[PDB]
Design a protein around this nucleic acid. Structure first.
Ligand code: ATP
Ligand code: ATP
Ligand code: ATP
Ligand code: MG
Ligand code: MG
Lengths: 337, 290, 229, 305, 250, 130
DNA sequence: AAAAAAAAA
């Protein structure tokens, strides 16, 4: 709630945390099931903060930076055991994050060589290690979110999108959604964001006075821990009243996503298929300038987003409204409003 | 105990050096320093060894040298004027003679004229070299302000002006002198370097060229051609008189009290008298002001 | 300087100049040297020493050598219109290092090439061992080793003639132009002294006659006659 | 869609003319075809399909794994560190089907390895006095893209593969897959993909009387028959080569300059006619096979535009 | 906290050169920093005399006495007492803002953002020193640090004004210094002829009348003010007095 | 510094392409044995031929002839194409020709063969001018 | 086996 704007970024994050279902076939091998989001923008536009929020609110996630990591040790390492005296593999950065989400900062500043590891993993969600007589395929079906800044200090709107991004096209084509953020100078928005940020910094922890700094505390009183339906104490979530629309607390949202990721596996119908194919054809043959080229992968992204939105409303079938909202989100992420 | 190799100046060209072991008893501890060429007078002795016999298969014995006298021979190769373990030590009568001859009128002129007696002219260069190798006084204000007390000298001019001969004489007469030249010196070679010890297997500090110049003079030839990355690593040595390293988990600061004397050549090989100094050399103000 | 990967060698390897100590180094094709050697040579030549300080090892190696080199003019053929500086690509400080220059040209004259081909053929088949030198190799080595054991000196008239010659050589070249001709330094006087001493050694005389000074001056002057022509 | 590439793969699975000629001159029955196309054309998916359906298929790439190129799999393997080694060898290079994605990615070592494997040449790289050469006889499958990732209106050899032209001339068939935005084709592609997704299975929209194991048996059956050549087509192939050299007379017209002169073009068309006699026909080589090979070459060049 | 020292390209700042190519740091790294000080050398011989006297006295023969008096008259405190005081203040106090201070901060941020937009629009290139929300957070932290000096639980206008002054110094010194970087100059000559022709030495005209006439002609308002203050900067024969109304020609 | 150089230029013509097509198709549808190797060994190590005085005149005449071509009716100082490398080329080639056929002294045919062989390569060394 | 510093291309 403390991040102003970035509405569709929040919507994409919500769809990503509880993405679509994985499809497997006896003849079609494997179909990717989750969604990846990449953000590029000029400095001080709240990308690292949103990434930290996603790290905090996710059920399972691993924090990683581009410069402080090495691709060889990021997937698997060979070390000797002190007791037995043999050598055994150690899980890497994203192997620990299997079925989770991996967040990487300074993505463009990472060494090019290590990027091949991502090229290995994001391709088929499986890393294969073959070194010192060890032959094993390790499963890693994680989703990766990255944030990188353009080559220049600030984004150039009048320049080619390709020359503004240091990353090669091969990896950029894999990411489903590309988001560009700029801090356009406008006195109205400057005043609004200024009063919002000043509101944020005037906050006091409950039950604690303002004259002394924040002090550490002890653990919970219990070493081990553990009327119905009439309370709605932490259900409604509107802890403080500042706007007419509702708001929900974080733990209930985590409970909601936990329930949704397990109890619901939706299926699609022909009504959404018609909208998907129609909007794909219209987007492909509009013949106007666009930020990124499209291909058959974008339609598969639309299908995965439609499945994710069929999951978000707790329904077993895909409604055409999900196709419409997915098309609108894609059109924003590729054209802009 | 210390390992003694062969001096590269006396080894046959293209061959390999020979190693021996030297043992230092009391009053000889820490006299020698790594990287410093020395001359040791000692006693040759032999002792039994087991593994050495095992590897060679013959009754071979190990040999060591126990030191009895050490004489430093770094830089000052001129070793014919006088004898002794050290040539920079004075007796009481020599102190008396110093005091007797230090009071006569116009001793500054005699000192200046007695330096490099085989070079004609260049009085200003001789005066500058004397003032640079005599040095000043470092200042410490309340233990909280530091003022450098050594003088740097830069030489510049046309070829065939015997700058290198002056540098050689300065190296000969100084107590602690180190000679570097052209591109043959790197940025990390002049300053301190970090190295992994092959035996104990952890990072350690290796004394650089400037560290050997403490209480002494560091001489550089062909200063202009030296690459900028190899030239920007001595700013602290000139001004701050300290070397700081933060590498491989080691955070230490090394003191360095050295005077830098450099020689170079202008653009085009000759000095254009009708142009300012800014258009004669490619050096900038941060290096020129020091 | 070479060191083993994670190895405690930190040893130096000797270049051709280092191996040629107390001898003659014969470098061929001087033109395509690189910057490091191109700036190390004019320190190795004049000061007869090489100094290095890299990666924690410092040393001053002895490089007492007598160098002889060959080169090819830029463009292939020597252009008689221009001078030595115009044709060669070497730097001005390197030229001052050398003590003598020899420029040799080929031509299309029919009288010379026939003699050259005949002499090549004769040595190839007819008289492959029957060449006619005035003295044998062993006699040459004996005389050279006998003459190397002499140290000539200089007399009063030799000094006066030498200073007069140096003054004349400094004056006449500086009369040409300013900021375009700069070729005579004290190194030229030292070269005259060395060449006179060598010529005195050749005749096995403990003293030096001004005729030797005149011959050395003639050599150094025709080194400048060539650059004019 | 993409019937041409599937037909080329089928003709590849049988193999060209082989087992030498008179006097011992070397001829290789393996066909070397390269696939050109922008990202997002499922050439990698088709490569995975052909690798899965071919028992001898192997997939490699530029680095990622180091013990795959220029070295065998038995390096420093035994507990005694006996250093068992053959020297210069590849992965199952004998009668194998090497498949590579991102054929512009690999470093100089693997590129030199391919330059060593050109035209069934043995691998003779030695390190410690070993000369146990591996008799490499394999077909080459290469999929790559121009480093710009898209086609350009300018001169087409400027894109090519960003690889030396000597390697390019080695290959038998070059096929280009250019993504052209069209409503009447992208509509069908989208409908087929979404119908595949809807059923969560292979759709009944397809109509194939043959099955993967069925053709797995039939490829071996057709390779067993092994027809031999016929003489009456020599004049036809000679005049075809003459008109190909006539085309080379116009290679300076440029903008699709790939129509260059090479005797390996004649060798490849002979091999493709042999394969077009091998795949279905009995011990007989027909002129229609030469005609079909010529049409395949023309269609392969046609995608340049 | 990071305290970094750096030198611009070409040694001295070389003010005649554009500010864009005197600093090689990217936009991203400069944003994290929030107090950028450009110390330039100057020559007027009075500050030079003062500095020479200061250094000459600070030579150890004299300073060893004078500084002692600074600890005897209570004008300064020793280093260790300052260390104890700073650790005590860091442990104890942690101030907080007030709504009036928040309003003043918001207004100041909007003002500086608009001024940056004006300078960018005139210059027609991206500014080498950016202004973002990080700068607003920086000013907030400066106000809080100023309030932390006196152990005040609440930060008020007295600290906010000084923090704003410090930020104004560190902004006008580096970011908004000579944004012009030195219609083109064809009008510049055309104006300067008119003032000499129509306005003799010693007389004066109102600013409003000159602006009116030159907006009536092709000159317009934007062109006039820039070279008006330029000719004032030249100060050879143009002087301002009596607020911004009297254009005196010296 | 090479002794010789050979250039191959495959250009599109009807006749040569037809001939290559026929020849390659016929191959697709008088040679000794290691005898060659032992003959070569015998020539290498038993045979040591020398040049005679008669061939010297022809060698000098050939050198002059390639010298005379190197200049023309203009004072432009045309390129010097007759180098001593050519001389070593012809002497070595003529001696090697006498090495073949197990002879002991050279004949004229050797020197004409050598000069023709070198000048055939030189005649194809010209650029677009001349 | 894997990380980090140095000289040469
Ligand atoms: N819309 C916003 N609402 C609240 N704070 C914001 C907003 N945009 C930026 N900020 C503030 O900008 C500051 C910069 O934070 P941060 O470095 O994480 O951002 P960023 O855009 O990811 O930067 P970078 O590209 O340098 O990593 C934060 O203190 C954050 O509070
Ligand atoms: N008064 C003098 N001034 C200059 N040179 C002199 C003088 N007296 C003698 N010489 C001779 O001049 C020569 C100059 O030596 P050298 O070539 O090393 O000098 P340099 O031009 O300073 O050198 P570098 O090439 O290192 O810049 C020496 O051989 C020296 O003997
Ligand atoms: N014609 C098509 N029919 C069906 N699926 C297709 C088609 N073209 C592309 N695809 C889709 O493309 C994906 C695989 O293609 P892929 O992107 O690997 O191709 P590529 O050209 O080799 O690209 P890259 O080098 O970027 O991997 C699959 O999800 C597949 O469904
Ligand atoms: Mg950030
Ligand atoms: Mg692919």
């Amino acid at each position: 709630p403390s991040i102003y704007g970035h509405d569709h970024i929040k919507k994409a994050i919500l769809l990503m945390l509880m993405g679509g279902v994985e499809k497997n076939l006896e003849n079609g091998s494997h179909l990717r099931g989750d969604i990846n989001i990449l953000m590029v923008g000029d400095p001080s536009t709240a990308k690292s903060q949103l990434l930290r929020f996603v790290l905090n609110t996710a059920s399972l996630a691993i924090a990683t930076t581009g410069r402080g990591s090495s691709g060889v040790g990021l997937t698997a390492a060979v070390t000797t055991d002190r007791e037995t005296g043999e050598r055994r593999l150690e899980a890497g950065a994203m192997v620990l994050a299997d079925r989770g989400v991996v967040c990487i900062d300074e993505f463009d500043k990472m060494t090019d060589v290590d990027r091949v590891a991502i090229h290995e993993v994001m391709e088929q969600q499986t890393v294969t290690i073959a070194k010192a007589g060890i032959h094993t395929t390790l499963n890693a079906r994680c989703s990766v979110i990255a944030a990188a800044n353009p080559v220049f200090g600030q984004y150039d709107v009048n320049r080619d999108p390709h020359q503004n991004i240091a990353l090669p096209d091969s990896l950029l084509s894999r990411f489903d959604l590309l988001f560009v953020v700029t801090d356009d100078i406008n006195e109205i928005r400057d005043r609004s964001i200024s009063e919002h940020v000043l509101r944020t910094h005037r906050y006091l922890p409950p039950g604690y006075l303002e004259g002394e700094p924040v002090r550490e505390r002890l653990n919970l009183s219990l070493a081990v821990g553990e009327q119905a339906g009439a309370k709605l104490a932490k259900n409604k979530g509107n802890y403080n009243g500042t706007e007419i629309p509702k708001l929900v607390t974080i733990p209930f949202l985590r409970k909601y996503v936990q329930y949704a990721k397990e109890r619901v596996i939706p299926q699609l119908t022909q009504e959404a298929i018609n909208v998907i194919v129609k909007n794909y054809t219209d987007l492909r043959n509009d013949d106007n300038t666009k930020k990124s080229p499209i291909t058959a992968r974008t339609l598969e992204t639309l299908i995965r987003l439609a499945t994710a939105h069929a999951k978000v409303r707790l329904s077993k079938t895909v409604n055409k409204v999900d196709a419409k909202v997915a098309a609108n989100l894609l059109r924003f992420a590729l054209l802009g409003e | 105990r210390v390992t003694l190799q062969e001096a590269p100046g006396t080894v046959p060209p293209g061959r390999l050096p020979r190693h021996r072991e030297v043992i230092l008893l009391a009053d000889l501890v820490d006299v020698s320093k790594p990287g410093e060429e020395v001359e040791v007078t000692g006693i040759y002795k032999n002792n039994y060894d087991g593994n050495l016999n095992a590897k060679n298969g013959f009754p071979v014995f190990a040999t060591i040298i126990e030191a009895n006298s050490i004489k430093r021979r770094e830089g000052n190769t001129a070793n014919e004027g006088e004898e002794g373990l050290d040539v920079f030590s004075w007796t009481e009568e020599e102190e008396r003679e110093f005091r007797k001859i230090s009071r006569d009128r116009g001793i500054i002129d005699k000192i200046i004229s007695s330096m490099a007696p085989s070079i004609y002219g260049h009085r200003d260069i001789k005066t500058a070299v004397a003032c640079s190798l005599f040095g000043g006084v470092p200042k410490n204000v309340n233990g909280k302000h530091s003022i450098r007390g050594d003088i740097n000298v830069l030489l510049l001019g046309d070829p065939g002006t015997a700058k290198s001969q002056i540098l050689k004489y300065v190296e000969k007469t100084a107590h602690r002198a180190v000679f570097a030249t052209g591109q043959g010196a790197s940025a990390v070679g002049l300053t301190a370097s970090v190295r992994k010890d092959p035996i104990t297997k952890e990072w350690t500090l290796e004394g650089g060229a400037l560290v050997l110049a403490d209480k002494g003079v560091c001489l550089i030839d062909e200063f202009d051609k030296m690459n900028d990355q190899d030239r920007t690593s001595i700013h602290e040595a000139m001004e701050q008189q300290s070397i700081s390293i933060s590498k491989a988990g080691i955070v230490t600061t090394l003191q360095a009290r050295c005077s830098i004397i450099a020689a170079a050549n202008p653009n085009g090989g000759r000095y254009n008298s009708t142009l300012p100094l800014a258009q004669n050399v490619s050096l900038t103000e941060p290096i020129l002001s020091r | 300087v070479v060191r083993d990967e994670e190895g405690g060698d930190y040893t130096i390897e000797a270049g051709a100049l280092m191996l040629a100590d107390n001898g003659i180094c014969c470098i061929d094709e001087f033109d395509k040297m690189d910057i490091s050697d191109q700036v190390a040579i004019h320190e190795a030549m004049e000061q007869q020493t090489i100094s290095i300080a890299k990666a924690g090892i410092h040393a001053t190696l002895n490089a007492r050598t007598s160098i002889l080199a060959a080169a090819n003019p830029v463009g292939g053929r020597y252009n008689r219109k221009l001078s030595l500086r115009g044709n060669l690509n070497m730097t001005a400080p390197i030229m001052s290092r050398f003590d003598l220059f020899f420029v040799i040209l080929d031509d299309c004259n029919e009288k010379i090439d026939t003699e050259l081909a005949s002499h090549i053929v004769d040595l190839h088949m007819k008289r492959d061992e029957a060449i006619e030198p005035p003295f044998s190799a062993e006699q040459l080595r004996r005389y050279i080793k006998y003459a190397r054991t002499f140290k000539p000196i200089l007399t009063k008239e030799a000094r006066s003639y030498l200073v007069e010659k140096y003054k004349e050589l400094r004056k006449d070249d500086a009369q040409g132009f300013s900021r375009s001709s700069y070729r005579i330094t004290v190194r030229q006087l030292e070269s005259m002294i060395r060449l006179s001493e060598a010529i005195a050694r050749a005749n096995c005389v403990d003293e030096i006659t001004p005729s030797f000074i005149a011959e050395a001056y003639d050599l150094l002057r025709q080194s400048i006659i060539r650059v004019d022509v | 869609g993409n019937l041409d590439v599937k037909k080329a793969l089928l003709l590849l699975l049988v193999g060209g003319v082989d087992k030498r000629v008179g006097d011992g001159m070397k001829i290789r029955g393996d066909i070397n075809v390269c696939l050109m196309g922008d990202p997002g054309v499922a050439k990698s998916q088709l490569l995975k399909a052909i690798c899965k359906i071919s028992p001898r298929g192997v997939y490699t790439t530029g680095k990622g794994s180091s013990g795959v190129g220029l070295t065998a799999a038995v390096m420093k393997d035994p507990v005694t560190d006996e250093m068992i080694l053959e020297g210069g060898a590849l992965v199952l290079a004998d009668n194998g089907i090497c498949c590579i994605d991102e054929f512009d990615k690999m470093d100089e070592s693997d590129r030199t390895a391919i330059h060593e494997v050109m035209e069934q040449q043995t691998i003779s790289i030695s390190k410690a006095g070993i000369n146990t050469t591996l008799n490499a006889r394999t077909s080459i499958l290469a999929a790559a893209n121009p480093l710009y990732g898209r086609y350009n209106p300018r001169l087409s050899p400027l894109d090519n593969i960003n690889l030396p032209a000597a390697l390019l001339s080695r290959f038998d068939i070059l096929f280009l897959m250019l993504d052209i935005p069209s409503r009447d084709d992208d509509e069908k592609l989208a409908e087929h993909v979404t119908y595949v997704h809807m059923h969560n299975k292979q759709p009944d929209l397809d109509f194939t009387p043959v099955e993967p194991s069925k053709m797995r048996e039939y490829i071996a059956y057709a390779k067993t028959k092994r027809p031999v050549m016929s003489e009456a087509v020599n004049d036809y192939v000679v005049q075809a080569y003459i008109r190909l050299r006539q085309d080379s007379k116009r290679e300076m017209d440029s903008k699709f300059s790939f129509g260059q002169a090479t005797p390996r073009t004649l060798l490849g068309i002979i091999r493709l006619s042999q394969a077009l006699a091998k795949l279905r026909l009995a011990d007989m080589v027909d002129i229609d096979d030469v005609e079909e090979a010529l049409r395949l070459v023309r269609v392969s060049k046609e995608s340049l535009y | 906290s990071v305290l970094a020292a750096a030198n611009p390209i070409y040694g001295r700042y070389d003010d005649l050169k554009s500010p864009g190519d005197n600093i090689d740091f990217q936009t991203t790294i400069l944003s994290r920093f929030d107090m950028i000080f450009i110390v330039k050398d100057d020559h007027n011989e009075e500050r030079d005399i003062s500095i020479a006297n200061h250094v000459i006295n600070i030579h150890t023969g004299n300073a060893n006495a004078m500084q002692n008096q600074q600890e005897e008259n209570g004008s300064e405190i020793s280093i260790e007492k300052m260390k104890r005081y700073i650790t005590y203040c860091r442990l104890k106090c942690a101030p907080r803002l007030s709504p009036q201070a928040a309003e003043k901060l918001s207004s100041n941020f909007v003002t500086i953002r608009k001024q940056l937009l004006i300078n960018e629009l005139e210059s027609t290139e991206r500014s080498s020193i950016p202004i973002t929300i990080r700068q607003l957070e920086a000013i907030i932290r400066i106000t809080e640090s100023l309030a932390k000096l006196e152990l005040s639980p609440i930060a008020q206008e007295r600290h906010v004004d000084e923090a704003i002054r410090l930020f104004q110094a560190s902004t006008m010194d580096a970011a908004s210094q000579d944004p012009i970087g030195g219609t083109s100059l064809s009008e510049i000559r055309r104006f300067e002829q008119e003032l000499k022709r129509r306005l003799p030495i010693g007389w004066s005209t109102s600013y409003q009348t000159l602006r009116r006439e030159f907006v009536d002609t092709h000159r317009f308002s934007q062109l006039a003010l820039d070279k008006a203050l330029y000719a004032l900067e030249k100060h050879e024969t143009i002087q301002l007095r009596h607020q911004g109304q009297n254009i005196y020609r010296s | 510094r090479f002794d010789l150089v050979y250039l191959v230029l495959d250009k599109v013509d009807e006749k040569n392409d037809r001939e290559l097509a026929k020849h390659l198709t016929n191959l697709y549808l008088v040679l000794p044995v290691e005898f060659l190797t032992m003959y070569i060994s015998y020539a290498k190590e038993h045979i040591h031929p020398i040049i005679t005085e008669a061939a010297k005149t022809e060698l000098v005449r050939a050198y002059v002839g390639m010298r005379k071509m190197g200049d023309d009716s203009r004072s432009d100082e045309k390129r010097i194409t007759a180098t001593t490398r050519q001389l070593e080329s012809m002497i070595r080639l003529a001696e090697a020709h006498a090495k073949m056929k197990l002879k002991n002294v050279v004949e004229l045919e050797d020197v004409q063969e050598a000069v023709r062989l070198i000048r055939s390569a030189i005649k194809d060394y010209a650029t677009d001018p001349k």
